[PDB]
């Protein structure tokens, strides 16, 4: 009880519970309460356009809550950073780290800030009284990967006993299906499963 | 010109008025404006899936408007609750207490 | 247990430069979320933020005293050291040392230390 | 207003329950979070009682309990002891970048 935010695109959450994957990858940040709408695959914004970019077949989930108890400060807080000026936008799972001048007219910067000469880089500024509007968010997204390969992501769920000579249904890694297993002189390539 | 969101899921509203019905329900609530997108079929959300599911053979009309001015406090009003947790997910049409 | 206690001479000369040092032990303050500040009391009356550094090094003041307020650190010291220029009879308080992390303000006091400013 | 408000003392029975009263405005206290009480054994070092606005302390008893009014806040305590004996405080995060006290409180149990 402590996640304000849990969507899931390209899988529900409730049988996430239950599901098998090849890998998943967890990226996090930390953005004020209003910019969690932002990130969604398809939504245009300051920081879906600047920060963070999600592929329009995304498929994964996004879980938020607030941090304001960790990551303010009573004067505020300027070590939390985000872009706001960028020459085009990111493509899909795209970092940036430069910290070159940006240029909002004719004026060339030249490596120097000035006149629509500015950093790229913007601090946010918590404080424990900041509106809920601003106040900082810890969010984590989760995006999925399955692949032509056994999948190493795997749920919590007890095997069951090998019921071996009646029909039934069954599941081995993954590999779902409707039948009666038994026993075959079958000699198996000795590396791989099925 | 007093609605913000009139989303009609399996009727158009410009020929509603040319068509007869058996019964018509009309269900009322309030929400906060950015969950307003959550009710609509198919749609997966901590306020569709334990307080209002739709049906996917839903056939109707949806009308959100704003009401800070009727339902809002200095003090904060706290007279709106919602579910927040549940057992299993929500049945379409289905009520709990 | 959180150990934390002070240190300096008691008398004080006005217009001199107050300095005081404070101790603790049991914990490092370069960890994130902890901090440690300052606060003085006058006899009768509510107690008086001074300053406070968090572990970053992020030093921050009452606006009332920033001129004045000076706060060193070092963690392999064990101690910090609060300074101060002008000083004037009527800062003669009891002054506490403190660590913080918001919420918890000021969650673990010191002793403190008996000031007076008196020529 | 931006020092909150508190009562010249207090005292009960022994065993009782009673509340000390902390006012002050929407712009700091109520419409806001964060409102702290704090006791104060006279000559020791105060220690935090209620920090955010009714919570079972860090690690003391739960005789204490605050209170969500709009405007005020109340820490009822219950089962007045010896030890009870001592001041009050309290406090909360100003509108401005800056934290405030109250205005003291005493607590007796009239022995």
């Known amino acids: 009880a402590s996640f304000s935010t849990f969507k899931c695109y390209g899988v529900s959450p409730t049988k996430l519970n239950d599901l098998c994957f090849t890998n998943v990858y967890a990226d996090s940040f930390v953005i004020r309460g209003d910019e969690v709408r932002q990130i969604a695959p398809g939504q245009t914004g300051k920081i879906a356009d600047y920060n963070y970019k999600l592929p329009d077949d995304f498929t994964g989930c996004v879980i938020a809550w607030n941090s304001n108890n960790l990551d303010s400060k009573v004067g505020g807080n300027y070590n939390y950073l985000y872009r706001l000026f960028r020459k085009s936008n990111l493509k899909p799972f795209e970092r940036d780290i430069s910290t070159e001048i940006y240029q909002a007219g004719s004026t060339p910067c030249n490596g120097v800030e000035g006149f629509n000469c500015y950093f790229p880089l913007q601090s946010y500024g918590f404080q424990p009284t900041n509106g809920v509007g601003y106040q900082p968010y810890r969010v984590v997204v989760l995006s999925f990967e399955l692949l032509h390969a056994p999948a190493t992501v795997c749920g919590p769920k007890k095997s069951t006993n090998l019921v071996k000579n009646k029909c039934v249904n069954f599941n081995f890694n993954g590999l779902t299906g409707t039948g009666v297993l038994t026993e075959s002189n079958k000699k198996f390539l000795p590396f791989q499963q099925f | 010109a007093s609605f913000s969101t009139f989303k009609c899921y399996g009727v158009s509203p410009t020929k509603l008025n040319d068509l007869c019905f058996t019964n018509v329900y009309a269900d009322s609530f309030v929400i906060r404006g950015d969950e307003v997108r959550q009710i609509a079929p198919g749609q997966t959300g901590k306020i569709a899936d334990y307080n209002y599911k739709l049906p996917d053979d839903f056939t109707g009309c949806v009308i959100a408007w704003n009401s800070n001015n009727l339902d809002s406090k200095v003090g904060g009003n706290y007279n709106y609750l919602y579910r927040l947790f549940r057992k299993s997910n929500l049945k379409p049409f289905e009520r709990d207490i | 247990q959180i150990t934390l206690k002070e240190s300096g001479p008691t008398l004080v000369k006005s217009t001199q430069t107050l300095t005081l040092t404070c101790t603790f032990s049991?914990?490092?303050?370069?960890?994130?979320?902890?901090?440690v500040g300052w606060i003085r009391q006058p006899p009768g009356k509510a107690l008086e933020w001074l300053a406070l550094?968090?572990?970053?090094?992020?030093?921050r003041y009452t606006p009332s005293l920033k001129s004045r307020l000076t706060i060193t650190k070092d963690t392999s010291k064990n101690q910090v050291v609060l300074t101060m220029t002008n000083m004037d009879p009527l800062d003669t308080a009891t002054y506490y040392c403190?660590?913080?992390?918001?919420?918890?303000?000021?969650?673990?006091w010191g002793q403190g230390t008996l000031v007076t400013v008196s020529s | 207003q931006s020092a909150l408000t508190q009562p010249a003392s207090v005292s009960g029975s022994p065993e009782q329950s009673i509340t000390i009263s902390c006012s002050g405005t929407?712009?700091?206290?109520?419409?806001?979070?964060?409102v702290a009480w704090y006791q104060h054994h006279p000559g020791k070092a105060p220690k935090l009682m209620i920090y955010?606005?009714?919570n079972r302390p860090s690690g003391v008893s739960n005789r204490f309990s605050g209170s969500k009014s709009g405007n005020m806040a109340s820490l009822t305590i219950s089962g007045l002891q010896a030890e009870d004996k001592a001041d009050y405080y309290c406090?909360?995060?100003?509108?401005?970048?800056?934290?405030?006290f109250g205005g003291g409180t005493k607590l007796t149990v009239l022995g």
């Open positions: 049991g914990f490092s303050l370069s960890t994130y979320g902890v901090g």
């Open positions: 929407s712009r700091d206290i109520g419409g806001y979070n964060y």
């Open positions: 403190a660590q913080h992390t918001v919420p918890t303000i000021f969650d673990y």
């Open positions: 955010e606005v009714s």
């Open positions: 550094i968090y572990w970053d090094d992020d030093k």
């Open positions: 406090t909360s995060y100003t509108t401005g970048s800056t934290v405030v």
